Assembly symmetry: D2
Homo-oligomer: 232 residues x 4
């Protein structure tokens, strides 16, 4: 006798192309059920994915959210997708490699507002500031940028914002000469997890992003160091 804000499918694995790049994405498609209805065409959620096509595009994602709301005869819902994203970048001096970043594109239709969010987990390098000054500790960190979008924003732009405010970016292949630069860059710029977040937010604190949730996790100890800063 009460409304179920999210009713739907979860963990739907089905291929997906983005732009071009073919990946595989896991879907979480859901709709809101009113207080008087009792069921939903969960089969339609599958039929959508299995029939939809085209490179996913800001516009194709917005249309896919709309088609769902009709196919399911609904007024609110969300389309969530988690897929691997790669980027062919160049070495700092070598000229050479592809890196894996996990992206999450989410779009909800509530109160006549189709809000498009996007998140990317980026591998980045960090170096302790206390050590070095304390002594005569360069682990890897995971930066998560969940950005509420006011206008279209590429994921590689967000990836660039994170790798550009860190002791060092990550490269799959790094010739031995490059290793020096990457290793010596941290020695110069000791980055405290407490600071990397502050610095990263400043780049988003950007108008294509009205709101965001940015988290930095360092893999020190067998524990971890985590900082999150939300906004509006």
């Amino acid at each position: 006798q009460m409304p179920i804000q999210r009713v739907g499918v979860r963990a739907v694995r089905h291929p997906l192309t983005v732009r071009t790049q073919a990946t595989v994405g896991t879907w979480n498609l859901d709709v809101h059920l009113p207080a008087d209805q009792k069921g939903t065409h969960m089969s339609r959620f599958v039929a959508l994915l299995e029939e939809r096509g085209g490179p996913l595009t800001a516009d194709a994602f917005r249309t896919m959210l709309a088609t769902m709301l009709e196919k399911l005869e609904a007024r609110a819902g969300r389309i969530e997708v988690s897929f691997p994203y790669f980027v062919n970048k160049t070495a700092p001096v070598s000229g050479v490699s592809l890196l894996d970043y996990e992206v999450t594109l989410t779009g909800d239709v509530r109160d006549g507002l189709t809000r498009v969010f996007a998140k990317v987990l980026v591998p980045v390098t960090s170096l302790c500031p206390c050590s070095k000054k304390i002594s005569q500790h360069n682990q890897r960190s995971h930066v998560t940028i969940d950005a509420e979008l006011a206008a279209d924003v590429p994921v590689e732009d967000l990836i660039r914002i994170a790798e550009e405010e860190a002791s060092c970016e990550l490269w799959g292949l790094l010739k031995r000469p490059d290793e020096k630069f990457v290793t010596e860059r941290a020695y110069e710029n000791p980055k405290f997890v407490e600071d990397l977040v502050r610095d990263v937010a400043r780049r988003l604190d950007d108008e294509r992003i009205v709101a965001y949730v940015l988290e930095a996790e360092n893999f020190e100890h067998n524990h971890s160091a985590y900082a999150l800063i939300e906004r509006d």
Copy 2:
């Protein structure tokens, strides 16, 4: 640029937990201790977090969790922060026909936050239950489709609530409860009662939410239910949220 959450993550440490009855259960809790850093400050004492779990000695009780939050806040010289411990819980149960005593696993998460001098204490429990699809017993001459289900109950608490009391609500409001040890009688009463009580992922959350609304000890809750479909590799999901003050 203030930092809303700054602390440690993924600290594992043994833990003692006290039940509704005079039973204390020893578990392993992975802790995530965090605080708030304003713009005036520019760094926190990470080591202090790790010290409070080692320093403390006792059975995590509803009052011991409160003191911990404050303790942490003072030991770091802050006025806001959060504490989350994820531990595995267990309850001895009597099988439906046998009465055989078997232990069932439960995933409990104790969280507590302080913001603006207000301490919201929340409790999430992952409850394993059985689901039987309603349009399978009426669409088919013989049989029905059954899967395992995950019922998650995150609840802001206005009062102490036993985690077993949250398990008792959901297990009662489902097609059939889970038991580790069952024999031929046990597995007969189980199968038949579930066919007799078929429910949707849509129905499950509603039945539970109503029992939740009869508990004034829970001011707010976020209910969730996943059905690991037997006929599909995908799962089904339903979610309900409620701030009773609105």
Copy 3:
């Protein structure tokens, strides 16, 4: 001064394109584990080679192409022994039983290739299926059923499309799995499960039977897990036959 059996990279995730049994192409993302062997004398390996080899490659991975990659590494890494492993999600167009509506199903496919003094090639298939206990029906109107995982690791003597192992498993379970199933189709899947109930042992035995008959599988290890719906524990059954 000790032979390090296999040293190399692990968890290298890289995009891959694989030709199917139909000749068609399947683009998936696979995580790679490329390693080499260090004799008692050699003390170090140029780890960077593995990474390069992956990105500087080209061509849809094939039975012949995969064997070639193992050979190329052995030269790029100055080695006589190495192992290359790729684990990737794979999909097939499964058509519904009664409505004929087609839909894709997920299958984790792991491909292992080893070249140690004889190049042994393997294939792993994870078949999700429905299980039904044969002792819930006889104990009236009612059965306990759930999802199951059939794992088939097979050493290849000739080319064997994974699709040839899925069918067997899907056919040897009480019911196969479908993503898009309409009301007419959700009744044949709920009935045949009652009709063809099967224990975890009754299942594994039925599957391994055609594996030793496939004759292109030199060896195999078959697993099956029932994610029981009446317990929080999973039923298991593993059978290992070499026949060599």
Copy 4:
């Protein structure tokens, strides 16, 4: 057809473990109990498997592990079977210089197998350690490039405490791990790990020497993953050795 392993999987049931000193430790383990099914009999009694865990008393010692193993063989009426449990283990360590203490998390998988009258018993430990680069340090003017996991699955010839298996990995690495660390303790770990850089290739060989010596261990499978901090992949190394050969 005969099936080698048939049984339960992923049963969570609290357990108590014996520490070297003799003290006890409470943990929660995931038990995987399985048997060998002959072509003669179609049905195992799976239930019993859960009954054997609930009907248990006291700490998992070396004799209690073999007792359980056997007791389950008689309750299930079989001639072969395996029992595996994986539990978190903790050790009250001492910070290098300040003496502040901290518990460290270790993953211990205890395997036991009766087959053909011979009861084999194995022990696996994952030890969280630090590694540094015997290539980045010198080649670079300043700075060093991560945490690693060392896994030692050892076939035991006699009763061996897991802490002794933990000691070999923590000592033959660059540095060990600590939960709580002071300022004087964080300066010794940064230099002494840098002063003693060891490769993944160098890490595994150094441990095996000690393993090859301990006559308590007849066979072992040694693994090492360095979880690279400059890269999105990890380094792997494996050693295999049944001295009886």
